[PDB]
């Protein structure tokens, strides 16, 4: 339960499934048919996000880590923040949302706090 839930990815529906049997926990969206499987090892993830409670729609994100371009500002100042490569999953259940929210958030943060 607290690792998966029916999500939608690339215009097709399925389940999102976080697996910790493996090397650093990976999130796996697999279509309802099971043909499409996309695995995201959470160690490569920097953040994760979800739809605000004001919005009815259900969404999670996987914010993958970025280039070390978090480096200091440019000679022209620029003031740059490196654009993250992220994933977005559509659900239609708040319980799933909150669980997937928590599941991803915590494991990600386990790699951050590292305790």
């Amino acid at each position: 339960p607290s690792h998966s839930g029916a999500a939608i990815f690339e215009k097709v529906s399925g389940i999102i499934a976080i697996n910790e049997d493996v090397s650093p926990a990976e999130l796996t969206w697999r279509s309802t048919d099971g043909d499409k499987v996309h695995t995201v090892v959470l160690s490569t993830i920097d953040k994760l996000q979800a739809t605000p409670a004001s919005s009815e729609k259900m969404m999670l994100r996987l914010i993958g880590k970025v280039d070390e371009s978090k480096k200091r500002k440019d000679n022209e100042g620029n003031e740059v923040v490196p654009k993250p490569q992220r994933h977005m999953f559509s659900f239609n259940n708040r319980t799933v949302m909150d669980n997937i929210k928590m599941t991803l958030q915590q494991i990600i943060s386990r790699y951050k706090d590292a305790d």
Partner: peptide
């Protein structure tokens, strides 16, 4: 084209709360 709006509505919904 569509994914582009997906990052828009996320901020739009955020700017709603950030009034």
């Amino acid at each position: 084209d569509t994914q582009d709006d997906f990052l828009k509505w996320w901020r739009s919904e955020e700017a709603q709360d950030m009034g």
